[PDB]
Amino acid sequence: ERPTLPIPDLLTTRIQLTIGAGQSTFGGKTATTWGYNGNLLGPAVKLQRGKAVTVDIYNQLTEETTLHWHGLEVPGEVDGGPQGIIPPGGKRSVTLNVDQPAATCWFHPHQHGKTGRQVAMGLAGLVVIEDDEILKLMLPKQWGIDDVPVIVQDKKFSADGQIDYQLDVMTAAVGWFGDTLLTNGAIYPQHAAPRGWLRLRLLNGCNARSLNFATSDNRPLYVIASDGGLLPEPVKVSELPVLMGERFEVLVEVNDNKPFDLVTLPVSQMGMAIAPFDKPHPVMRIQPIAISASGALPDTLSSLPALPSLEGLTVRKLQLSMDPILDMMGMQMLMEKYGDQAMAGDFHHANKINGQAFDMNKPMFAAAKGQYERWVISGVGDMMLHPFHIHGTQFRILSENGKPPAAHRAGWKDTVKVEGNVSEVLVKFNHDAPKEHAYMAHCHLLEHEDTGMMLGFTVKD
Ligand SMILES: [Ca+2]
């Protein structure tokens, strides 16, 4: 027997999110965990393009927190920038006026120095943006039945059953990773899927572990959407790498009564091919049921504007770097504890952008509003994986780590891979972020961000 896959409540849209500590059980041991309106994770907030909703956020924890609307094209005031800290027992109200295509976004704490720990404790929620366009496509759309969110996260636990989180020299170097895989908070759950097409909204919500999705019988995954929404057409893939914080929506066929698994395949990332992730690892069991769903795989999904002329656009260079000491010690501890499988394929300001660890009150530059810019992000100089996330925008990747992006990564993205080479993205910011509410750009390997690999920037007309 497997647990049934939990489905976050879809909150149709004033909304309250109460941030609080509860309890969860994993393999018969109880752990203190944190959730939005629950023990763990959070709801799926449903937003309609062009309609405003106010979100009341109440912090019932005993420590400060913040909330990042990951993927939303909103003013910097929504996250709050440096003015976004919600004290224990405090509250903050924001207004979300969505003006972007349909997409699956998400939200999560984002306080510098504490983001890894607060996500590890359980905090994460979803944002389902809908528009007029996507509803004409007749995709699978019955939430929790044939339209299913899949939030995949690893954790590790102490002997006493508690979540075993630490920001130490080793995790500052390679990230916090564990040996237990959760799917919407459950270990290897099952989902009962109607015959036809099954839509999976995939979110890599790990602190540091990259994932690579596939099916146990290697049937195709039809990618229909990236971080920022629909592709122009479905893209058939046999495997789907997903970086930390990225989302993809895929359709998979359910065409007989035999169960199969969604799995994740071993990645070439420091520390992440350690057992039990040295082999394909099940994510969830898909059990077909003898009732039809009528959702379709459309031949065409959407229209993607042409990349504009790069002639005359501002080019901003961002160099990612890691203190050489941190690299050395952290590497040595990883090798000492886990051996060769770890390579299969002060430290609190040691990770930097442009030679600077994040300074919350000094934005690095002012970006133009409503103008395309080319941002060049280099990881030359270290071998670590850095998924690079830019707030306030959905951008287009021009070069992903020294190569043009894969077709299913060539649409709307808020994250780009950087791993030893150079990426280039085309960004435009439609909304204001003054100094007091600055946007951020940062590595989404959370322990890197927490140890300085983040910058602030403003946006003004
Ligand atoms: Ca509901």
Numbering used by the authors: 30 to 42, 47 to 378, 403 to 518
Paper text:
CueO plays an important role in copper homeostasis by oxidation of toxic cuprous ions to cupric ions. As with all multi-copper oxidases, it contains four copper atoms distributed within one type 1 (T1)2 copper site and a trinuclear cluster comprising the T2 and T3 copper sites. A distinguishing feature of CueO is a partially structured 45-amino acid segment (residues 356–404) capping the entrance to the T1/sCu copper-binding sites. The goal of the current study was to engineer the highly compliant MRS such that CueO activity would be modulated by engagement of a partner protein with a scaffolded peptide.
